[PDB]
């Protein structure tokens, strides 16, 4: 889908409307963000590994631009001068108060709100790399993946919006349509992660 | 968002409004306040670290401004001049009355009604560290966080309020929309608080 | 079928159409795409064997084009120049970080987001074997498989879409027809996957 077949589809399914093309656009954009704010997250939004450079004597670390959440299976990693590193561990701030006023490599990471924190204070310059889900806009990818993936969800949900502003009954028919698609999407996501892994009880 | 797109969205959704933008502004602000008063606290309301100094022989410490509720896996911290620190414990006033007259380092406190009381009463001035949840009207960051994240709740609630004022049926529908959105955000909060923690007994 | 009988069937079933064949074509294609995006993968979407070669010191391998999900009782295979081969194992990124710096034969991988990563990193160019599910728009066989098998789903869904666009009641009826057909095909998939297998514990 090419961001143009979407508006054509919206006109066609809405009833062959003609002169709302600006409106259509405003709305489709309003929509992708809303869905992004949603609590569920699809699978195409994990960023390429991004790293941050940290200056010494500072514990708090700014959150990446437009961050949403960390990766369930990926963690902050520090890369030393030799090229190797270690995986840092996270804990609630309270449990991490003990290492206050201590010396060494970093060891623990905590969320706070906008700032990560390193309580084992790195006395020198340091860097870590992360794997995090990020807002669609921020990602470099030449084009919006939402356009490619589940374009139907997108079509449906925007149609609902204008229709809600049009106080017409079928707003719901579309809403419901979005839902089926949304559920299915979660199934695809869950179906894909475990596709070829073998588990053992140890 | 930029506080303009939100207004034009409100105008478009509820029936292509032209001139109620003044009522839009008045009633919209009201929304942010109402939601803040409600029992729920989203993550992006979390304030940054705070500190305070209290004089000698004054066991009463007033509540910090704009305070709502402390951070759960956070606690009151006592910072000494030597750089060493400690975390004071919390108990009900009753349990803590006993110490009435024990001099030395502060150890405990109670919420009481509007003032902090430390029964181990120092004889000199002393500094404290504190963390809590604060209203957006009282945080020191430039932009209001609420617009950025959860715009929809804000779009819906003002509309629900705006539409309910004119005695129009769709009020129940919009209120249901807002309720669904609130449940979504409540799920998303736990999505982040326990995002990638690892736990083991002891 | 031959893509003509399908169109004339669509025209006849929905009320003896004459001229909407252009909309028929546009909206029909859309159907095949929508269905592909959905959580289900019918057997005749399965791609043929694929191979790829990656250069030295480059542990990142991009996703094959048109990929959706790998084949479950299939797995990534490493082919060596001597004709000998092996099958690499799958684990989450976290489990597999340890090997960071172990040289030799590749052994493991992770799905990650869009790129394959092998932590046992060879120092030379190397060839890989792969199998997966691909979209019909990206398979190398001359004809689109979907028309041949499961035409009915395709007949119904485009009609359901075509009829729902004009705001006509029978939309629910046609959607139910499509749902029944999808359940049928889902049953038929398992009819073939486990057609005549014989099993015994170990």
């Amino acid at each position: 889908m090419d961001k143009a077949t979407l508006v054509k589809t919206i006109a066609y399914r809405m009833g062959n409307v003609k002169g709302q093309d600006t409106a259509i656009d405003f709305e489709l954009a309003l929509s992708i963000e809303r869905l992004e704010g949603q609590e569920f997250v699809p699978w195409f939004l994990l960023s390429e590994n991004n790293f941050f450079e940290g200056t010494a004597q500072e514990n708090r670390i700014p959150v990446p631009r437009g961050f949403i959440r960390e990766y369930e299976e990926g963690s902050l990693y520090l890369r030393r001068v030799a090229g190797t590193g270690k995986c840092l561990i996270k804990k609630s701030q309270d449990q991490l108060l003990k290492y206050e006023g201590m010396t060494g490599e970093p060891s623990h990471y905590s969320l706070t709100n906008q700032y990560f924190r390193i309580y084992p204070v790195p006395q020198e310059d340091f860097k870590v790399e992360l794997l995090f889900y990020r807002k669609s806009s921020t990602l470099n990818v030449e084009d919006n993946p939402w356009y490619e993936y589940a374009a139907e969800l997108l079509v449906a949900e925007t149609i609902w919006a204008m229709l809600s502003a049009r106080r017409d009954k079928m707003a719901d028919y579309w809403k419901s349509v979005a839902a089926d698609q949304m559920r299915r999407l979660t199934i695809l996501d869950a179906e894909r992660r475990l596709a070829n892994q073998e588990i053992f009880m140890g | 968002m930029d506080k303009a797109t939100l207004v034009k969205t409100i105008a478009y959704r509820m029936g292509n409004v032209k001139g109620q933008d003044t009522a839009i502004d008045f009633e919209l602000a009201l929304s942010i306040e109402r939601l803040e008063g409600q029992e729920f606290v989203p993550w992006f309301l979390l304030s940054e670290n705070n500190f305070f100094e209290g004089t000698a022989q004054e066991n009463r410490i007033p509540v910090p401004r704009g305070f709502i509720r402390e951070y759960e896996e956070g606690s009151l911290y006592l910072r000494r001049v030597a750089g060493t620190g400690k975390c004071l414990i919390k108990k009900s006033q009753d349990q803590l009355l006993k110490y009435e007259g024990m001099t030395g380092e502060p150890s405990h406190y109670s919420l009481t009604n509007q003032y902090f009381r430390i029964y181990p009463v120092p004889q000199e001035d002393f500094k404290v560290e504190l963390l809590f949840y604060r209203k957006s009207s009282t945080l020191n960051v430039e932009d209001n966080p609420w617009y950025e994240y959860a715009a929809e709740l804000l779009v819906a609630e003002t509309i629900w309020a705006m539409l309910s004022a004119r005695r129009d049926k769709m009020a129940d529908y919009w209120k249901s929309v807002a309720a669904d959105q609130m449940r979504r955000l409540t799920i998303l909060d736990a999505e982040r608080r326990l995002a990638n923690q690892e736990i083991f007994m002891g | 079928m031959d893509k003509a009988t399908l169109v004339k069937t669509i025209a006849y079933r929905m009320g003896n159409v004459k001229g909407q064949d252009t909309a028929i074509d546009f909206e029909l294609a859309l159907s095949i795409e929508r269905l592909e995006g959905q959580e289900f993968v019918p057997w005749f979407l399965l791609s043929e064997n694929n191979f790829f070669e990656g250069t030295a010191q480059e542990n990142r391998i991009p996703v094959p084009r048109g990929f959706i999900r790998e084949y479950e009782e299939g797995s990534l295979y490493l082919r060596r120049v001597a004709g000998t081969g092996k099958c690499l194992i799958k684990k989450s990124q976290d489990q597999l970080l340890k090997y960071e710096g172990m040289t030799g034969e590749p052994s493991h991988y992770s799905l990650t987001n869009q790129y394959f990563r092998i932590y046992p990193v060879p120092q030379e160019d190397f060839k890989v074997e792969l199998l997966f599910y691909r979209k019909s728009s990206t398979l190398n066989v001359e004809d689109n498989p979907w028309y041949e098998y499961a035409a009915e789903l395709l007949v119904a869904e485009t009609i359901w879409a075509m009829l729902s666009a004009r705001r006509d009641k029978m939309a629910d009826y046609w959607k139910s027809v499509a749902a029944d057909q999808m359940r049928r095909l889902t049953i038929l998939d398992a009819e073939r996957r486990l057609a005549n297998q014989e099993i015994f514990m170990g």
């Binding site: 941050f52 708090r60 700014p62 631009r65 | 100094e53 401004r65 | 990142r60």
Partner: peptide, 19 residues
């Protein structure tokens, strides 16, 4: 009433790896 708010002046910037 002297709750002061410490300021965050440390530079905030990230980077991305080329494919």
């Amino acid at each position: 009433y002297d709750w002061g708010r410490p300021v965050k002046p440390v530079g905030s910037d990230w980077s991305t790896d080329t494919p």
